Design a protein around this ligand. Structure first.
Ligand SMILES: O=C(O)c1ccc(C(=O)OCCO)cc1
Length: 263
C-alpha cells in the first residue's frame, strides 16, 4: 500500500523553494558529543511519524556556522539533522567521515534516550550524509564505507582521491563554478564522473565561490529545493519528489547540470 515513510504535504516548487518547510523546528546542543567535537540537533516537533537522520560536516577550518542553514531547512521538511564541529578544525576527510558517522550513531542513541527531545523521533535505519569541502569528501567516504546509507549530498567536495566508484548510495554533488579552493574540474566533476553504480546528480552554481552552498548563500531557494528533494526521494523512498530530485531545474543560476540513474 502507502509508503510508510512519506511525511508532509504534496510538494510544489513554491513549497520546496520556501525558506521553511511545513514542520515546526526546535534544536538542542549535544551535551556530551560521542566521537566528534560538538553538535547541534535540529528536529521537527510535529512530523507525524519517525523521520530519517542526516549528519552534516564543515570544511577545513570551518565550524557549524558554515553549514547551519541546512539544519532548519531540512528538519522543517521532516528530518533530524545534526550539524557538527570536528575534534580539530584541521581534521582531514577520513577523520571527518568517522566523526560524521559517530554523530549519526549518537543520534541513533538519543532516539533511545527517554530524556532526549528526539526520543522516538528517528528511524535509525534511514540516514544521510552531507558536508562542505573536506567534509564533502568525508561524506563520500562515509557513503563508500556504509552502503546502507540512503542518500549523500555533499557540497564543493574535495578528497585526495577522486575515485568514488565504490559508492552505491544516491549522491547529489553541489559544485561552485569559480571554486578556487577545490576547483570543479579537478575535484567535484572527477568525483561525479567516478560514480557508476548509483543514482547521481551534479549541480554547479554559476559564478559560485567555494562557499556557494554555505549559510548565507544567495541561492537558498534552488539549493534547498534540490537538497530536500534528493533527501526526500532517497531517504524516504518518496516518489512524490522524483521529478524535483531528477529534473534539470532549468535555472539561469546553474552552469553545469548532470544526472544518471535517477527515477
Ligand atoms: O575543506 C577545505 O576547505 C579544503 C579542501 C581542499 C583543499 C585543497 O588544498 O585542495 C587542493 C586542491 O585545490 C584545502 C581545503
Amino acid at each position: 500500500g502507502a509508503n510508510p515513510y512519506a511525511r508532509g504535504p504534496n510538494p510544489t516548487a513554491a513549497s520546496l523553494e520556501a525558506s521553511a518547510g511545513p514542520f515546526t523546528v526546535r534544536s538542542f546542543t549535544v551535551s556530551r558529543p560521542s566521537g566528534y567535537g560538538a553538535g547541534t540537533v535540529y528536529y521537527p516537533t510535529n512530523a507525524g511519524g519517525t523521520v530519517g537522520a542526516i549528519a552534516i560536516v564543515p570544511g577545513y577550518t570551518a565550524r557549524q556556522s558554515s553549514i547551519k542553514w541546512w539544519g532548519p531547512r531540512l528538519a522543517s521538511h521532516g528530518f533530524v539533522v545534526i550539524t557538527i564541529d570536528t575534534n580539530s578544525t584541521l581534521d582531514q576527510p577520513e577523520s571527518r567521515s568517522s566523526q560524521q558517522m559517530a554523530a549519526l550513531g549518537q543520534v541513533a542513541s538519543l532516539n533511545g534516550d527517554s530524556s532526549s527531545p528526539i526520543y522516538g523521533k528517528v528511524d535509525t535505519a534511514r540516514m544521510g550524509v552531507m558536508g562542505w569541502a573536506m567534509g564533502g569528501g568525508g561524506s563520500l567516504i562515509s557513503a563508500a564505507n556504509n552502503p546502507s546509507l540512503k542518500a549523500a549530498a555533499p557540497q564543493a567536495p574535495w578528497h585526495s582521491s577522486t575515485n568514488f566508484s565504490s559508492v552505491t548510495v544516491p549522491t547529489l554533488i553541489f559544485a561552485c563554478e569559480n571554486d578556487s579552493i577545490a576547483p570543479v574540474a579537478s575535484s567535484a566533476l572527477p568525483i561525479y564522473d567516478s560514480m557508476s553504480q548509483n543514482a547521481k546528480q551534479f549541480l554547479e552554481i554559476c559564478g559560485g565561490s567555494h562557499s556557494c552552498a554555505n549559510s548565507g548563500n544567495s541561492n537558498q531557494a534552488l539549493i534547498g529545493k534540490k537538497g530536500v528533494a534528493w533527501m526526500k526521494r532517497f531517504m524516504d523512498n518518496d516518489t512524490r519528489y522524483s521529478t524535483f530530485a531528477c529534473e534539470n531545474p532549468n535555472s539561469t543560476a546553474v552552469c553545469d547540470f548532470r544526472t544518471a540513474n535517477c527515477s
